[PDB]
Amino acid sequence: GLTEEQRMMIRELMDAQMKTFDTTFSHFKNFRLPGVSREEAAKWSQVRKDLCSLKVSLQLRGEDGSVWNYKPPADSGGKEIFSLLPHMADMSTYMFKGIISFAKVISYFRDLPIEDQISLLKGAAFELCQLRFNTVFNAETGTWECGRLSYCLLLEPMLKFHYMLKKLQLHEEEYVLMQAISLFSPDRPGVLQHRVVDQLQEQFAITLKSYIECNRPQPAHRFLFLKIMAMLTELRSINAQHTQRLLRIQDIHPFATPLMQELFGISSLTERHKILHRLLQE
Amino acid sequence: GLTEEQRMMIRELMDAQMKTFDTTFSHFKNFRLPGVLWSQVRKDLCSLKVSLQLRGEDGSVWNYKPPADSGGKEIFSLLPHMADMSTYMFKGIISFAKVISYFRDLPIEDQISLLKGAAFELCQLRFNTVFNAETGTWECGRLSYCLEQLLLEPMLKFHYMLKKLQLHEEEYVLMQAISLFSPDRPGVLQHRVVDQLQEQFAITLKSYIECNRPQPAHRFLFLKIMAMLTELRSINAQHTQRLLRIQDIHPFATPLMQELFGISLTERHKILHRLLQEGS
Ligand SMILES: O=c1ccn2c(n1)O[C@H](COc1ccc(-c3cccc(C(F)(F)F)c3)cc1)C2
């Protein structure tokens, strides 16, 4: 079995998750919707690729039974494929806030210095959002099912990530431990208490390993923990790749919300991050 | 061939049609849409259930599927939109009548009376020209209205039958003219001048058909069209009734619609009067 310490480590993460993860997206409201030189062109062509991968239809089920459905353009002359970016900005921003709240209720994270709390959330925010998104991914229909909202589409790393993680059929406890391990990465830019963070991450990984030994049948889940650790490594790479895409798009066509600007780097740490700081302070 | 006077007549109507019928609906704007989120009344709404498509000038597509009837109130979701579209069509019809010499010479009160009586009908006639019978959808530029046995609903049957006749533009516009100059609309004073005008349009229609449609597919075409116009008059009455029932339970009509659908003429129709006095 798990040590008492480990079971309560899990209890605390699971309670943090249930307090701060709106799984039906009921409180996602007031979001925007798609409306109803040589160097510059070199920037644009890189951005066109970046936005292609980024293609979903959007579905909108009302209470009455009505359904609105949005289908994105094909890429033409220019702007029309920035159509979804305001909506996406709002969805991510909503998801980030939940992730910030998640971090805050965790004693282990609270005790860290505010500046490290900021650095860790800057470093992991995208990864935890994707981990949460995976839990509402339906691999049969290639659809993220977010309450009344749906996003519908394997070489794109992000998409293959979600099919792959979904195949592992993780438990809630394993997802939330994944979130902890990603959140407490000692090797994020700007982290100071490297030693403390590392020991905390190791605690979580050990806890995750132990959970798997104890709760899943023997030889068949022999390597599950290492597979999960491999997924985290792949997610970390997707994070970096995705940040660079977002920064290129932002550069030519600004879309990021204030909070997103703080996270992606768009004086001091707390001063470059007044919103994040506020959100952590309350 | 046609007399000179008839050629001229058709030319004026066709010119009028072209000037006042935006077939790409490019200037239909600022309409309401369903939010993103009694027994007789429910029967009405259900017969004429459509899904709505809007294509962006960029390639994008929004599609809206209506709720199944599960109780009430959700069955009214498309009404504000339908009212905006009908109001846009009616204004085009008003412009159409305005540019016709034979109409603008009538007393302002008859102009009002004829338009009250015919607007719905002319609107359906224009809608039929953008009706796709294969797909069951009215194709209005970037907007589309797709039907969700159905011929049982007189409105739907009308559009299918009329589409089947494969009329020319000339024939649609002569139908519009005949419907417009109905001497027996309520409140019409110069019923005699109107009747003579209607008779000349009907004669021109019959002559046009004889000078242009030899094929046995078109035998009796003129008489079918006139029969269709009588049927359209009956649908008009029916649909006006449906609308009052629905407006009673649940208001949705625009101010211009409330004017057209009733019930000193100029005083009770301030918007019409205004549009008629305005230059075309
Ligand atoms: O916002 C969403 C909506 C759906 N999904 C998701 N994020 O992760 C999966 C793949 O689809 C995506 C579409 C857009 C983004 C996106 C767009 C703009 C900004 C951001 C970010 F969070 F990084 F700021 C993320 C991410 C993923 C599934």
Swiss-Prot record, chain A:
Q: Binding residues for hyperforin, per the UniProt record?
A: S92, Q130, L131, R132, F133, H242
Q: Which residues form the NR LBD domain?
A: 5-261
**Subcellular location(s) of the protein:** Nucleus
Tissue spec:
Expressed in liver, colon and small intestine.
Q: Which residues form a coiled coil?
A: none
MF terms per GO, please?
A: DNA-binding transcription activator activity, RNA polymerase II-specific; DNA-binding transcription factor activity, RNA polymerase II-specific; nuclear receptor activity; nuclear receptor binding; RNA polymerase II cis-regulatory region sequence-specific DNA binding; RNA polymerase II transcription regulatory region sequence-specific DNA binding; sequence-specific double-stranded DNA binding; zinc ion binding
Protein name (Swiss-Prot/TrEMBL) = Nuclear receptor subfamily 1 group I member 2
Q: Which residues of the full protein are shown?
A: 142 to 426 of 434
What is the similarity comment for this entry? Belongs to the nuclear hormone receptor family. NR1 subfamily.
Originating species: Homo sapiens (Human)
Signal peptide residue numbers = none
Where this protein primarily resides, as one coarse class? nucleus
Function according to Swiss-Prot or TrEMBL: Nuclear receptor that binds and is activated by variety of endogenous and xenobiotic compounds. Transcription factor that activates the transcription of multiple genes involved in the metabolism and secretion of potentially harmful xenobiotics, drugs and endogenous compounds. Activated by the antibiotic rifampicin and various plant metabolites, such as hyperforin, guggulipid, colupulone, and isoflavones. Response to specific ligands is species-specific. Activated by naturally occurring steroids, such as pregnenolone and progesterone.
